[PDB]
Design an enzyme around this catalytic site. Structure first.
Site, short mmCIF file in Angstrom:
data_model
loop_
_atom_site.label_atom_id
_atom_site.label_comp_id
_atom_site.label_asym_id
_atom_site.label_seq_id
_atom_site.Cartn_x
_atom_site.Cartn_y
_atom_site.Cartn_z
N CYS A 146 0.88 -1.20 -0.58
CA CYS A 146 0.12 -0.19 0.26
C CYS A 146 0.82 1.15 0.01
CB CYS A 146 -1.03 0.32 1.16
SG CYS A 146 0.21 1.02 2.48
N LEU A 582 -34.53 -9.87 32.97
CA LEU A 582 -33.20 -10.59 34.59
C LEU A 582 -34.70 -10.38 35.77
CD1 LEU A 582 -31.44 -12.38 34.22
CD2 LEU A 582 -30.17 -10.41 35.73
N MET A 600 -29.13 4.00 32.65
CA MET A 600 -29.38 5.27 32.34
C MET A 600 -29.95 5.83 31.09
SD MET A 600 -25.00 5.46 32.58
CE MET A 600 -25.29 6.74 31.17
N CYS A 657 -19.83 -4.24 28.58
CA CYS A 657 -18.79 -4.25 28.23
C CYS A 657 -17.48 -3.37 27.18
CB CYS A 657 -17.17 -5.86 28.53
SG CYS A 657 -18.83 -6.91 26.43
#
Ligand code: ZN
Ligand code: ZN
Lengths: 1035, 524
Positions: A146, A582, A600, A657
């Site tokens: 490249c 849950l 939130m 995460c």
């Protein structure tokens, strides 16, 4: 501009605007996916000046070269340690889709808020700052072809984009998923050194004279006094092992051998999953005891059983220096029993020595004896005697009692039915003008669930001497025909209950070792209630109504000889609940009342409010809430009463995460990001509130994040915090869901409680998506699940999830429509409910573009069909533009030419060492250009634009369905629409009465993110079992 | 002192004859003798009162308190007149009311001859009840009761049952015990005593017996077991027509263990129609009314359809008769559109053409469905309208799958008005007209197509508008007439008479993009 050149100028302005939108969007966030990019592009309003209707995926796929070059130019000027902006998963997906070569031209612009801090408590901050010490300890070159790589002189301007992309792909992939990796061998199995002590002698007389060569003593002298219960360090033969410490449970003189002593080994934290994160002075109990000579005794060690305080519930938040008193840490200490087979941390076993064995009792010996006796299959009560066999009334195995009359599980190979059971084209070469991409098509299956039988008699064959042979026990079993196994075959099970069984008269003989469990099989009429209540009453409950005659292939009435506490609900805090999957699962389990929730995202909080009227939701970031709780306030800004100490009983959640999504070894930047993430905040929540039960849910890669470092650190925090912890991997599709999504689950139980076991699989699933094992520090860890690719109930498919929904077409937005039909399967019957006159809600699907609509209208309905079956036929679209035929302008060596001799290449890139030719790209074609442009490098993009299979399942969770996404197939099996919001909710197992909120996209995201309640219910049941046991203890 | 009394319901043995169901009698199909009695009255007083009132000696009747059992059956129980004689009835019933008692008397034609009430030893005697099942007529015949020692062998009772049921003696008999509904247990050994032969032997158990005869294999219910089975699943369903308001419907007796095909066949028979010309609706369950429609392939039984009714509640099932076969009816596509009538008024209509048909088929259905003009053309057309503007006319060859599924798209079907059917193409032009108040975005009203001549006296167009609308002749005046194109609008003076097609056609050779249209301003 001139009218002739007006389209080209408009295209150039469109390029500018799409590049600008992409760059600002990537400024906004660096974790979005390809679907998010497509939505952001489409939602953008075209400018008043430019005469463009709306940007669609075709515009992005045709301007990919320019937008990617501009984005690479943006981050190529200012270089920092942060991840480059073009490595974002959305943009990596876009580069992988359209054949854009990275690292050319660029620099054409012509010279053109806080780290925050999680409100961690004293203890968690102590643990993380302690581990901060060891994080500082410290192939795939540049491509060279490249332009940037070819440029002369790593350098910030010479960061090879191809190298960065390969590194990112390695980061996302699991390195490496080697199945073997053998299971860990027993520890301390090596030999130990012999020590040269001066004089060793007994003190007193023989404490216990058993009459054999063994004479037991209590006090020994090896220049130091040793009694029973004192701990000894032993130096083994040097094999990179530290000094072993073992409790001397018994010492005795042998008349045959030398001077003996039985040592129950401790285990250092470094040898467990805790690894280097463990405290060097901390130890754990194990099931490893062994008798040696006292000649290898090296020294005496002092250990303390650091028992939890009597007021352990209120100890959270207190400074540990205040509780550090005293003389700690100076000597070794242990607080938790450790099981390495399942990676389980428990409170020390409460087995008690007997008076006869008081001066010899070894807890390892007693536990091993109990385990060995429990596992041995033994018969219990003799009933009657024959000349060749002897009959019994009951038997025991693995702590389960089977009498005569209980339903029994048997492996699928145990016996076969007398019915014939399993009783055993090619189109012409398709028109390569009309089907020019069929050549790219070409040129494990889910096992049967448990066989179920009913015991008629238990018998043992008489030996040669005539005595019964208790080593082997034989079972005579009346078989039960599932509707699947009936002569009607698989189509019979579409509407039959997942529980239904057929009584038979054929008998089978099996070995008692083949028995896998007890299930309660019962009639339907003799039931004292409706069959629905009995089915929902308890696990492994099967009901049969009419018997099956194999020879006549008919259904008759079963013969006559075939007919025969509630604890208070825990208050729950649910962190990062989302739409409340849950919490709904736990509510269905009947064990939890969620009295608080943190989220939130506003639409998710609104959905939680709608679904749970009797709950309070704090729509503020968890750090502010925790800081306010620590500071001692009682009302937030809006006056909602925050929970205080002792209010929280069960703490459940799953934290995002995004910050630590990488899988390479830890780095100071990444560890600094982790140190103030949301998982550390959630651990701080568990520390302060000290809940009885603690649940962490996350994606599978949570286990192996940063070389298992996140999992190890979380387990270390839990262990130091005084809990009992375990972790495992659960496959969702095994618990009544038609979807493959593996989830990592961390369970924790308060001291004095019982650590819950992971739920057993219910519905058999394909073995390719059931790899529940874990690799940590070159060790293989398995959950306590005993069912391996087998189960009582059959698999749940899409046909049992979405078949009955009334047909709707693309762009439907009618929130409230009529069902217009009774449910046709067990799953939909359970999901709808008992009352029957509702209005079906949120049965809407995204309004795709006209080109996409035509393409996915022309996809055939054959199973497994995808873009490779798209016909290259000129077709009018809805808006009125023209979808021109896709043209072949090159020849590709790797695949060859068609049978008709037509060219198969699409671009000059097919030839090796040839850059992609500009202006050779086509757009607005029925067959997409990018798919044949870059099929060879991505396995022909198999599964793209494909339809769901009526016997298959969803590839993964569908957060935002898009035909050209990585979430697998998203087209409806029969209709020309993508999967609807209600269909996605049905996939997750949500009840049809569950309420969502927001626009269509927010509803899709809420459905995708939430945990399937059927999975949560299975876990919730297991927690309730330990709730029973702790209450059952009181006597 | 009404709270001190109780209803005592006496049933006699004559009521046992003819009962075709389980146990002794049908609770609904029985005549009682009701007694209002003081709770503190003794039982002896009640035995005296009944014997005197009904005309029997007190020692010629026996009282068998009707007692409910665990299995769900309700059978006669034992009461000791002597030992327990001084206790009140409210404590003896254990808070039950009404209180049913079996009265065992001697047959008055066998009592006039001097016989009296036999003695009964609680420990060694038992009261057996005998029923006879006749397969040919498929019915039960009550054969009275017997006193028998528990230890007696069945073989010694066979002659008794034979001559007690009117059978030739030494006839081979098949014996069952009707333990409860759906539980009829065959007695395999006749050489064993009653204690061994009958599990959980109590007073009031019933043994059913029938002839042992080969002819039974020609019957559809050869044995009493299969009889009680078919009876256990029999249920009377009330079928009601959903079109008829408050139709009381008709009652058909079917079996719960029945699929869709058999039910449909039965109803079609009782309705004199083809089974395929019927669509069924389950009840909404708690309310009475038609619920979810049933598909033709439904793989279920009657219990699933009746499962949310209480056993007390009447179980209703709705239906409607069809003019076409049920499969094609299930593959019809609901197409909601607007019908324009002769009075220029909008009506909502819903048609069910085949999902794969064309526009032609839709228009043909509407023609079969509607009436045409007095003597107009008789030809209809399909407009597609968005924002009260006609965005297209659909040619009758268009595919139904090719039509705009979007809710902003409204399909209208209308009879072409006489001055619009055949017009003059190079002079008269059809212009699209819409309403709007103030600005042109807030459109409203009924948009329409208006004919325009060539060079025509714009106040002719305003007297045509006035002739169409026909409100009072002043309120027309506030209409502001404008020409709208791509959002721009220029208002035009009505008395200036400015008209010609060129200011209404788009640029040369232009169709694809919006054509100039007429805009009207006033308030709604
Ligand atoms: Zn031991
Ligand atoms: Zn190329």
């Amino acid at each position: 501009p001139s009218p002739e050149y007006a389209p080209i100028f408009g295209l150039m302005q469109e390029k500018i605007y799409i590049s600008k939108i992409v760059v600002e969007f990537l400024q906004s966030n660096s974790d979005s996916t390809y679907e998010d990019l497509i939505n952001k592009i489409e939602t953008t309003v075209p400018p008043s000046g430019l005469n463009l209707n709306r940007f669609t995926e075709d515009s992005l796929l045709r301007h990919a070269q320019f937008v990617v070059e501009q984005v690479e130019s943006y981050d190529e000027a200012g270089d920092s340690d942060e991840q480059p902006i073009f490595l974002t998963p959305c943009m990596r997906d876009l580069i992988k889709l359209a054949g854009v070569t990275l690292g050319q031209r660029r620099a054409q612009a012509r010279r053109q808020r806080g780290p925050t801090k999680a409100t961690t408590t004293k203890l968690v901050y102590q643990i993380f700052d302690t581990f901060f010490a060891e994080q500082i300890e410290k192939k795939r070159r540049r491509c060279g072809v490249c332009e940037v790589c070819q440029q002369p002189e790593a350098c910030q301007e010479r960061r090879c984009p191809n190298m960065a992309m390969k590194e990112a792909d390695d980061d996302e992939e699991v390195d490496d998923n080697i199945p073997e990796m053998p299971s860990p061998k027993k520890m301390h199995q090596g030999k130990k050194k012999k020590q040269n002590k001066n004089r060793i002698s007994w003190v007193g007389e023989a404490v216990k004279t058993d009459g054999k060569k063994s004479y037991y003593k209590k006090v020994c002298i090896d220049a130091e006094t040793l009694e029973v219960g004192d701990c000894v360090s032993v130096i083994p033969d040097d094999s990179s092992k530290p000094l072993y410490l073992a409790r001397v449970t018994a010492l005795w003189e042998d008349s045959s051998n030398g001077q003996m002593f039985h040592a129950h080994w401790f285990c250092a934290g470094t040898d467990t999953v805790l690894g280097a994160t463990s405290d060097p002075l901390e130890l754990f109990l194990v099931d490893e005891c062994e008798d040696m000579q006292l000649s290898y005794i090296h020294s005496k060690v002092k250990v303390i059983y650091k028992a939890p305080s009597e007021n352990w519930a209120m100890e959270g938040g207190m400074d540990p220096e205040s509780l550090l008193e005293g003389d700690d840490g100076k000597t070794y200490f242990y607080q938790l029993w450790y099981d390495q087979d399942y990676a389980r941390f428990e409170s020390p076993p409460k087995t008690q020595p007997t008076e006869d064995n008081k001066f010899k009792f070894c807890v390892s010996c007693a536990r091993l004896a109990e385990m060995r006796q429990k596992e041995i299959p033994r018969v219990l009560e003799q009933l009657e005697d024959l000349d060749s066999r002897v009959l019994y009334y009951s038997a025991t195995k693995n702590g389960i009692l089977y009498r005569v009359g209980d339903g029994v599980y048997l492996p699928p190979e145990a016996f076969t039915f007398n019915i014939k059971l399993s009783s055993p084209p090619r189109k012409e070469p398709v028109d390569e003008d009309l089907y020019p991409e069929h050549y790219r098509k070409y040129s494990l299956d889910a096992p049967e669930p448990y066989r179920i039988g009913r015991i008629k008699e238990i018998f043992c064959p008489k030996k040669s001497n005539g005595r019964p042979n208790e080593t082997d026990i034989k079972i005579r079993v009346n078989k039960f025909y599932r509707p699947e196994n009936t002569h009607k075959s698989t189509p019979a099970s579409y509407h039959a209950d997942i529980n239904l069984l057929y009584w038979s008269d054929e008998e089978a003989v099996v070995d008692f070792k083949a028995v896998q469990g007890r299930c309660t099989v019962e009639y339907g009429e003799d039931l004292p209630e409706c069959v629905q209540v009995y089915s929902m009453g308890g696990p492994n409950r099967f009901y049969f109504l009419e018997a099956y005659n194999a020879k006549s292939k008919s259904f008759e009435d079963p013969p006559n000889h075939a007919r025969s506490i509630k604890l208070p609900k825990l208050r729950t805090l649910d962190v990062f609940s989302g739409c409340g999957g849950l919490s709904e699962g736990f509510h269905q389990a009947g064990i939890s009342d969620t009295l608080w929730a943190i989220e939130m995202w506003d639409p998710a909080a609104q959905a939680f409010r709608l679904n749970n009227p009797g709950s309070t939701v704090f729509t503020e970031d968890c750090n502010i809430l925790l800081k306010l709780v620590m500071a001692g306030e009682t009302t937030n800004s809006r006056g909602q009463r925050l929970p205080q100490k002792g209010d929280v009983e069960m703490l459940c959640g799953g934290p995002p995460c995004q910050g630590f999504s990488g899988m390479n070894r830890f780095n100071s930047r990444t560890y600094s990001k982790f140190k103030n993430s949301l998982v550390v905040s959630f651990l701080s929540y568990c520390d302060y509130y000290r809940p009885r039960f603690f649940l962490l849910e996350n994606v599978r890669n949570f286990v192996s994040f940063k070389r298992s470092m996140v999992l190890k650190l979380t387990l270390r925090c839990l262990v130091r915090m005084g809990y009992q912890c375990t972790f495992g991997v659960l496959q969702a599709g095994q618990y009544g869901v038609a979807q493959t999504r593996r989830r990592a689950i961390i369970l924790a139980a308060a001291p004095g409680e019982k650590l819950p076991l992971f739920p057993e699989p219910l519905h058999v699933f394909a073995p390719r998506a059931c790899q529940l094992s874990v690799v940590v520090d070159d060790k293989k860890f398995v959950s306590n699940i005993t069912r391996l690719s087998s189960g009582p109930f059959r698999t749940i498919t899409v046909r049992d999830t979405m078949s009955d929904l009334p047909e709707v077409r693309n762009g439907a937005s009618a929130l409230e429509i009529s069902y217009n039909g009774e449910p046709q399967s067990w799953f939909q019957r359970q999901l709808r409910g008992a009352q029957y006159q509702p209005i079906l809600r949120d049965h809407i699907c995204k309004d795709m573009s006209a080109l996409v609509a035509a393409r996915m209208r022309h996809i055939p309905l054959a199973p497994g069909s995808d873009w490779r079956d798209l016909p290259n036929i000129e077709v009018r679209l809805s808006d009125g533009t023209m979808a021109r035929k896709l043209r072949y302008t090159h020849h590709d060596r790797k695949n060859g030419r068609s049978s008709s001799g037509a060219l198969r290449g699409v671009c000059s890139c097919v030839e090796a060492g040839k850059a992609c030719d500009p202006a050779a790209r086509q757009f607005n074609t029925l067959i997409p250009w990018c798919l044949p442009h870059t099929g060879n490098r991505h396995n022909h993009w198999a599964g793209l634009y494909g339809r769901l299979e009526w016997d298959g399942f969803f590839s993964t969770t569908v957060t935002n369905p898009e035909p050209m996404g990585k979430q697998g197939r998203v087209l409806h099996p029969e209709q020309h629409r993508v999967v609807s919001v209600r269909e996605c909710a049905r996939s997750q197992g949500f009840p049809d009465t569950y309420r969502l909120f927001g626009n269509i996209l927010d509803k899709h995201r809420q459905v995708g993110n939430a945990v399937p309640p059927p999975l949560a219910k299975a876990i919730g049941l297991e927690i309730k079992l330990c709730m029973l046991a702790k209450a059952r203890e009181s006597a | 002192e009404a709270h001190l009394y109780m209803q005592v319901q006496i049933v006699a043995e004559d009521q046992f004859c003819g009962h075709q169901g389980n146990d002794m009698y049908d609770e609904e199909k029985v005549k009682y003798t009701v007694f209002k009695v003081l709770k503190n009255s003794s039982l002896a007083e009640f035995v005296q009162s009944l014997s005197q009132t009904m005309g029997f000696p007190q020692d010629q009747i026996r009282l068998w308190p009707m007692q409910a059992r665990s299995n769900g059956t309700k059978r006669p129980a034992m009461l000791d007149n002597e030992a327990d004689g001084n206790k009140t009835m409210i404590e003896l019933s254990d808070n039950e009311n009404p209180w049913t008692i079996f009265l065992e008397t001697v047959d008055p034609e066998l009592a006039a001859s001097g016989a009296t009430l036999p003695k009964f030893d609680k420990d060694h005697d038992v009261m057996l009840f005998l029923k006879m099942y006749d397969p040919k007529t498929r019915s039960l015949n009550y054969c009275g009761h017997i006193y028998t020692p528990i230890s007696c062998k069945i073989r010694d009772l066979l002659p008794v049952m034979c001559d007690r049921a009117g059978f030739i003696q030494d006839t081979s008999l098949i014996l069952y015990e009707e333990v409860k509904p759906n539980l009829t247990e065959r007695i395999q050994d006749y050489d064993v005593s009653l204690d061994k032969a009958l599990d959980e032997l109590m007073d009031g158990d019933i043994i059913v017996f029938q002839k042992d005869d080969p002819e039974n294999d020609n019957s559809e219910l050869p044995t009493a077991k299969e009889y009680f089975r078919d009876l256990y699943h029999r249920v009377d369903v009330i079928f009601c027509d959903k079109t008829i308001p408050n139709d009381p419907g008709f009652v058909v007796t079917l079996s719960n263990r029945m699929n869709y095909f058999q039910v449909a066949k039965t109803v079609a028979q009782r309705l004199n129609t083809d089974p395929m010309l019927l669509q069924f609706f389950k009840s909404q369950g708690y309310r009475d009314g038609p619920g979810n429609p049933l598909r033709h392939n439904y793989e279920g039984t009657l219990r699933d359809l009746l499962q949310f009714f209480k056993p007390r509640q009447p179980k209703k099932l709705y239906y409607q008769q069809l003019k076409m076969k049920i499969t094609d009816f299930e593959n019809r596509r609901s197409f909601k559109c607007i019908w324009l009538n002769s009075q220029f008024r909008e009506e909502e209509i819903t048609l069910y053409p085949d999902k794969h048909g064309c526009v032609r088929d839709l228009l043909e259905e509407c023609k079969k469905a509607v009436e045409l003009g007095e003597k107009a053309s008789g030809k209809l057309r399909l407009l597609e309208i968005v924002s009260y503007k006609i965005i297209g006319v659909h040619q009758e060859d268009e595919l139904l799958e090719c039509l705009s599924p979007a809710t902003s798209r409204t399909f209208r079907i209308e009879e072409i008005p006489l001055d619009q059917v055949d017009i003059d193409k190079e002079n008269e032009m059809l212009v699209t007209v819409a309403h709007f108040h103030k600005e042109v975005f807030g459109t409203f009203g009924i948009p329409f197509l208006l004919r325009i001549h060539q060079g025509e006296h714009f106040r002719e167009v305003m007297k045509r508008i006035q002739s169409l609308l026909d409100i009072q002749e002043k309120e027309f005046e506030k209409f502001k007439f404008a020409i709208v194109m791509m959002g721009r609008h220029q208002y035009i003076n009505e008395d200036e008479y400015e008209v010609n097609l060129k200011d209404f056609e788009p640029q040369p050779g232009n169709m694809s993009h919006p054509r100039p249209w007429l805009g009207l301003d006033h308030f709604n």
